[PDB]
Amino acid sequence: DNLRHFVQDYAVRALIPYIEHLVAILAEGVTAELQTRKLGDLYFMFGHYNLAFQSYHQAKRDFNADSAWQYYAGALEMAALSAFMLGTAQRKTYDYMEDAIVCYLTVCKLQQFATRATLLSMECLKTARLYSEVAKQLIRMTNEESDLRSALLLEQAAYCFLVTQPPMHRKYAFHIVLAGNRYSRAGQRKHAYRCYRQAYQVFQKREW
Numbered sequence: 547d548n549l550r551h552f553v554q555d556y557a558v559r560a561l562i563p564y565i566e567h568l569v570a571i572l573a574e575g576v577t578a579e580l581q582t583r584k585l586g587d588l589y590f591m592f593g594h595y596n597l598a599f600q601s602y603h604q605a606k607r608d609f610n611a612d613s614a615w616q617y618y619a620g621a622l623e624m625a626a627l628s629a630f631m632l633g634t635a636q637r638k639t640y641d642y643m644e645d646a647i648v649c650y651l652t653v654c655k656l657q658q659f660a661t662r663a664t665l666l667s668m669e670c671l672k673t674a675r676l677y678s679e680v681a682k683q684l685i686r687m688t689n690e691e692s693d694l695r696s697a698l699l700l701e702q703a704a705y706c707f708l709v710t711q712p713p714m715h716r717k718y719a720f721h722i723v724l725a726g727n728r729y730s731r732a733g734q735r736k737h738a739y740r741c742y743r744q745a746y747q748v749f750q751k752r753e754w
Contacts, residue, residue, distance in 0.1 A: 568592070579608050583617055586624055595628035615650045616659055622646035623663055626670060635674065643667055648683060660687060661695070668702070681706040685721075693728035700725030701741060719748040 568591065575588055586601040602621035609618040622642045629635040647663045650656065664687055668680040681703035688699040704722045707715070722745050729738030 579612070582608060583621070586621065590624065590627075593631075595632055598624050598628040613653065615646075616654065616656055619646035619650055619659070619663060623666065626667075630670060630673065635670070640671070640674075640676075644679075644683065651687075657691060675710070677706045677709040693732050697725040697728040697733045697741075700728075701737075704741075715748055715752060719745050719752065722748075 572588065572592055575585060582601055582604045586598050586605075589597050602618070602625045605618050605621040609615055612618075622639075623646060626635065626639055626643060629639055643663075647660060647667070651660050664680075664683060668684065671677060671680050684699050684703045684706075688696045688703070690696075700721055704718060704725070707718045722741055726738050726741040726745060729735070729741065
């Protein structure tokens with residue numbers, strides 16, 4: 547009722563003092579190796595992209611000796627977020643992206659952070675015009691540890707294969723069928739059917 551909204555407004559006005567609390571926490575933060583990281587963690591919410599800017603900057607001088615680049619990877623993705631929030635998203639930043647993620651995969655057996663950061667990269671490049679590099683990295687991280695990840699990822703790389711331009715779909719079908727049988731082994735039955743169906747269109751259109 548109306549009194550329900552009285553209490554709702556009571557609640558939200560009570561929450562405003564928490565935003566003042568976090569302003570005070572920013573104040574206590576402004577003036578160490580993990581201190582720089584916790585700063586960026588904080589002002590994700592505050593929106594200080596400039597601070598995240600200098601944050602991953604200081605992070606490179608910090609992790610230079612420190613092989614723990616998973617944290618530095620996350621610094622590069624926070625750089626990316628800050629960037630396309632501002633809208634710039636420098637090409638070179640994108641490079642740091644894999645320089646963030648894929649490189650560390652070589653040294654450390656850290657699969658799930660690879661998955662998450664790779665995906666968020668996939669959609670951020672979906673915002674960009676470049677839909678391919680996500681597919682090619684996605685192929686390599688596709689197969690391992692599972693077919694459920696594998697088959698879905700092959701589907702996404704499939705539609706990427708022709709988001710901008712189609713050509714050379716022989717390989718397209720020849721791998722999405724691999725995705726579909728992995729569906730049939732463990733993935734969804736119905737989506738196995740639908741991927742099979744679209745692959746059957748591609749089959750019918752590619753005789754040569």
